[PDB]
Amino acid sequence: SQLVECVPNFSEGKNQEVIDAISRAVAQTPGCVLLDVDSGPSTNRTVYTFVGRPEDVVEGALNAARAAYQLIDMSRHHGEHPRMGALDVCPFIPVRGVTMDECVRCAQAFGQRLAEELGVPVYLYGEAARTAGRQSLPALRAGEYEALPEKLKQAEWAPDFGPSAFVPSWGATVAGARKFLLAFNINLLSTREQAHRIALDLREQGRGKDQPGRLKKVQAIGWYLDEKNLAQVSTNLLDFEVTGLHTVFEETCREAQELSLPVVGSQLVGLVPLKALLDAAAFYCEKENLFLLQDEHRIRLVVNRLGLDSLAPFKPKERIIEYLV
Amino acid sequence: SQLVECVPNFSEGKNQEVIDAISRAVAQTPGCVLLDVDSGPSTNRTVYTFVGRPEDVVEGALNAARAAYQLIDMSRHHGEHPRMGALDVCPFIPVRGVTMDECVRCAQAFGQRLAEELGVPVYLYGEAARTAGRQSLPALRAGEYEALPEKLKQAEWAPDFGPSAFVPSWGATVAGARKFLLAFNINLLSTREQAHRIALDLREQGGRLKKVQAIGWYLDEKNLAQVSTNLLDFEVTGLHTVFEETCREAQELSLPVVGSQLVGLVPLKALLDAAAFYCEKENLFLLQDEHRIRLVVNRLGLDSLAPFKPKERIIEYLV
Numbered sequence A: 001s002q003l004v005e006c007v008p009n010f011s012e013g014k015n016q017e018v019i020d021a022i023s024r025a026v027a028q029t030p031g032c033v034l035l036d037v038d039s040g041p042s043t044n045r046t047v048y049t050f051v052g053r054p055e056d057v058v059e060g061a062l063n064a065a066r067a068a069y070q071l072i073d074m075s076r077h078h079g080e081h082p083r084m085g086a087l088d089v090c091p092f093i094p095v096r097g098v099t100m101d102e103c104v105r106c107a108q109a110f111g112q113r114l115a116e117e118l119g120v121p122v123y124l125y126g127e128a129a130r131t132a133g134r135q136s137l138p139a140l141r142a143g144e145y146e147a148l149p150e151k152l153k154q155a156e157w158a159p160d161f162g163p164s165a166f167v168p169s170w171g172a173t174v175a176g177a178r179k180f181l182l183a184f185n186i187n188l189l190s191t192r193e194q195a196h197r198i199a200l201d202l203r204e205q206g207r208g209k210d211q212p213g214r215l216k217k218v219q220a221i222g223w224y225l226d227e228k229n230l231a232q233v234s235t236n237l238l239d240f241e242v243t244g245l246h247t248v249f250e251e252t253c254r255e256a257q258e259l260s261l262p263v264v265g266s267q268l269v270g271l272v273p274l275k276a277l278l279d280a281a282a283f284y285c286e287k288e289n290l291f292l293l294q295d296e297h298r299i300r301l302v303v304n305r306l307g308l309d310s311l312a313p314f315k316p317k318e319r320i321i322e323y324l325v
Numbered sequence B: 001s002q003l004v005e006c007v008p009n010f011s012e013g014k015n016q017e018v019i020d021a022i023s024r025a026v027a028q029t030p031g032c033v034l035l036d037v038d039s040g041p042s043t044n045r046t047v048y049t050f051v052g053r054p055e056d057v058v059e060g061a062l063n064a065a066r067a068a069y070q071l072i073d074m075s076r077h078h079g080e081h082p083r084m085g086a087l088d089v090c091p092f093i094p095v096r097g098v099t100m101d102e103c104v105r106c107a108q109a110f111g112q113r114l115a116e117e118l119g120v121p122v123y124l125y126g127e128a129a130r131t132a133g134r135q136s137l138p139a140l141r142a143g144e145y146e147a148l149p150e151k152l153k154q155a156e157w158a159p160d161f162g163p164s165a166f167v168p169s170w171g172a173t174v175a176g177a178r179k180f181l182l183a184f185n186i187n188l189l190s191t192r193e194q195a196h197r198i199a200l201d202l203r204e205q206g207g208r209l210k211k212v213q214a215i216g217w218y219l220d221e222k223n224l225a226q227v228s229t230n231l232l233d234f235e236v237t238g239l240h241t242v243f244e245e246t247c248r249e250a251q252e253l254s255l256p257v258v259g260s261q262l263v264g265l266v267p268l269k270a271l272l273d274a275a276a277f278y279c280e281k282e283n284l285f286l287l288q289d290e291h292r293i294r295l296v297v298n299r300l301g302l303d304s305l306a307p308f309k310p311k312e313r314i315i316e317y318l319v
C-alpha cells in the first residue's frame, strides 16, 4: 500500500469559513485522509497535512487549489509568513512504498494540471527542481507576491508550468517533492529585529554566499506575532537527521542568552515524525545522564525541554504522524 | 463588600457525579462564587476554591459538607493524598476587608456547626488552633482515616467540636484559618519512593525549605511521580526556590524533572517573585507583567499537565 504525504500551505489563516472549505475539498477527495489543519492569524497562513496513494493526493491537492482559487484574493493578503501564492507551496513526501522519484512525478503532474486549469505560474522546487536555483523555496519566494509582476517579465523566472502572467488573485505556486520537513518556531521575548538577527546567524544560507550560517539544513527568519505578543525565530528543519530539533533549539537559546533575551518554549507547526522527537530525547538524556526506556517518557521529556506546550497543549497522538497513521 | 476565600478538600476525585454535586452545593449557595474545581483520580481528592462574604462561605462550606456526607463513604476510600475525612480540611482565608481574627471566627463557627449538625468529630488548625500541637494539619492527620478508631479513644485526641465517635462513612474533619497557601507539585520521571525521599529532604519538618510541607506520590493516569508541596508562606519560600531545589535533588539521583503543576489559584505576587528570580539569574529586563508570567510558566513548566491560564488562575485577575 503506497502512501504519500502532501502538506500544502495556503495564504489564509483568519477566515475560518475559507479554511474549512479547503479542508472539505481535501477530506472529500477519494483516497485522501486529512490529518491536520494548522492555521495562524498573524502569520495568516494555514498548512494542511494529508496522506493517500500518490495519484489520490495529487487529486486532493488540486481540489483544494480549486476551492482556494475562488476563496482567496492575494491582492488583499498580508501576513508575517513569506508568501507569493494563494496555494503557496505544495510538497509531496514519500511515506511508504513510494520512491522520491515518483513523488517528483506527482509534483510534475500536479504542477502541470494546476497551471493548465487556473492559468497561473508554477515553479518546481526541492527534489523536483529543474535547476539548482529553484531547489530552495525561500529563493523562489524572494521578493514575495509583491515582486511577481517584475519577476514574471524576466526569462530566468519563466515558470516550469503555466504562462508568465501575473494573476492578482492567485500569484504563483511552488510544487515539489522532499523528505519530511519540520516547521519549528522558537519563542523569545525580544524585538522582531533581534529574532531575525538570530535567524540569520543560524540558518545555513546565513546572510549570503559569503556569509554562511551555523546550521546545515536549516532555514529561518524572525518575526513578531500580534496574536501572541511575542517574537519567534521561525525555522524549517530540512533534514532532522542532519540537524535536529534539540540542536536548533539549543543553539537559538545560546544566541538569545548572549543578548540577554529569554527563550520561552517553542511551537511545532503541523506534524512531526516520531524519530525527530526520540532523537531529541536521546540528546537530553545524554546531556543529563538520564535513563528512560518508555517512549511516552522520552516524549514527555522532550516536550518539556523544548517547551512544546508553550502556546497550546502538545498532544502526541494528534501530532506524531506514526501515531496518526 | 467583605471577601473570604474557602478552599475545602473532599475525598473524592474519580466520581464526576459526586464531584459535580458538591460543586453545585457551593455554587447554589447565596453569596458564594466557585472559582475553581481541581480533581485527581490517583490522589482521589478534589479541591474547591470559592469566595464570598464571611457568613456566606461558612454556609457554602456547610452545604458542600451535607452533600458530601450523603455521597462519600470513607470506609471505601483510598488515595495518594493523606486524608481522614470526607471533607478533609476546610480553610478560611482573608481576601478583602476581613481580618484574620474574623476568619478564625468563621473557622470556629463552621467547625462547630459541621460537627453538631452531622454528628462528626472536628479539629481546629492553623490560626484557629486551640492548642499549639494542633496548628499543624500533618500532626492532626497523622495515621489518617485508618488511625481514627484508636485515636478517638484517647483523651488527647478529643475533637474540638462534636462527638468522639467513629463515623465510618465520614471520618473526621479539620477546619481552620490561614494565609494564602500554594499547592504546587513538581513532576519527576522516577518511582514513588524516590519522589518521597526528595520530599523528606526538602520539607521543613524533614529539611532545607522553610515553610514548606512535602510528600511524594505517583499519578497512575499520567505515568509519572510528583514531589507534592504546600508553600505555607511564599514570601518566605517561593515557587522558584521549591522548584529549583527539587530539580537539584533530582539531578543528584540522575532523575529528570518535567515541569510542574499548580493546584487551585495563586496570588499574582507569587508568580512575579518567581519571575524576578529568573530575571536575576538570566540578566533579563521585562517591562510587561504578561511576559513575566509567561517566563515563569515556561521555567517552572506550569503547562506540563494542562494549560495554565493566568486569567483563570491568578487571584487578582479573578477578583
Ligand SMILES: Nc1nc(=O)c2c([nH]1)NC[C@@H](CNc1ccc(C(=O)N[C@@H](CCC(=O)O)C(=O)O)cc1)N2C=O
Binding pocket: A007, A009, A013, A038, A039, A040, A041, A042, A043, A044, A045, A046, A047, A081, A089, A091, A137, A178, A181, A183, A185, A225, A227, A234, A236, A269, A270
Ligand atoms: N494560533 C497560531 N498562531 C500561529 O501564528 C501559528 C499557528 N497557530 N499554527 C501554525 C502556524 C501558521 N501556519 C503555518 C503554516 C506553515 C508554515 C511553514 O513554515 N511552512 C513552510 C513549508 C516548507 C515546505 O513545505 O517545504 C514554508 O516555508 O512555507 C508556517 C506557518 N503558526 C505559526 O507559524
Ligand SMILES: Nc1nc(=O)c2c([nH]1)NC[C@@H](CNc1ccc(C(=O)N[C@@H](CCC(=O)O)C(=O)O)cc1)N2C=O
Binding pocket: B007, B009, B013, B038, B039, B040, B041, B042, B043, B044, B045, B046, B047, B081, B089, B091, B137, B178, B181, B183, B184, B185, B219, B226, B228, B229, B230, B261, B263
Ligand atoms: N487530573 C489531575 N490529576 C491530579 O492528581 C491533579 C489534578 N488533576 N487536580 C487535583 C489534584 C489532586 N488533588 C490534590 C488535593 C489537595 C492537595 C493539597 O496540597 N492540599 C492541601 C491543602 C492545605 C490547606 O488548605 O491547609 C492539604 O494538605 O490538604 C494536593 C493535590 N492534582 C495534583 O496532582
